[PDB]
Amino acid sequence: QRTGRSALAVLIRACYRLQQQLQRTRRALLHHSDAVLTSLHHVRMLL
Amino acid sequence: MDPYCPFDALDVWEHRRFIVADSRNFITPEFPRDFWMSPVFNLPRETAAEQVVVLQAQRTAAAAALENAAMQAAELPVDIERRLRPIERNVHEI
Numbered sequence: 001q002r003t004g005r006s007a008l009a010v011l012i013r014a015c016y017r018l019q020q021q022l023q024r025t026r027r028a029l030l031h032h033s034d035a036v037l038t039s040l041h042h043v044r045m046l047l
Numbered sequence: 048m049d050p051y052c053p054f055d056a057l058d059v060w061e062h063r064r065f066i067v068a069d070s071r072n073f074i075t076p077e078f079p080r081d082f083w084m085s086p087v088f089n090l091p092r093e094t095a096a097e098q099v100v101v102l103q104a105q106r107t108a109a110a111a112a113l114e115n116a117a118m119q120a121a122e123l124p125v126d127i128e129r130r131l132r133p134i135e136r137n138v139h140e141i
Contacts, residue, residue, distance in 0.1 A: 025131065029127055036120055040113060040117055044113045044114075
């Protein structure tokens with residue numbers, strides 16, 4: 001019984017965690033362009 | 048034009064050792080006053096007002112460029128949220 005039942009665990013562990021890989025990448029990479037915008041706005045301040 | 052002076056001139060015959068009350072003669076150079084050109088304040092080509100105008104024009108150009116950078120770089124989060132959300136949904140489809 002535990003052949004296919006455990007075989008499904010591999011695909012579950014891969015896909016269900018690749019799911020939130022994209023979530024963490026979204027949470028992190030969005031916090032990068034805000035700094036660029038802040039820097040360019042400070043540059044506009046200095047002129 | 049001559050500075051005023053009560054005494055015109057007199058005859059003085061100085062010595063070397065016994066100069067008592069040692070004064071300070073007003074020394075004069077030997078080159079003619081014709082070689083000593085009159086002073087002229089060379090006015091700068093531009094005035095501070097023109098400097099303000101030119102620098103302000105350059106600031107306007109730089110600010111226009113910075114605004115262009117702002118509008119091109121403000122859409123990057125929009126690109127992030129436009130590209131990953133369909134892929135995140137596709138991964139959820141599994």
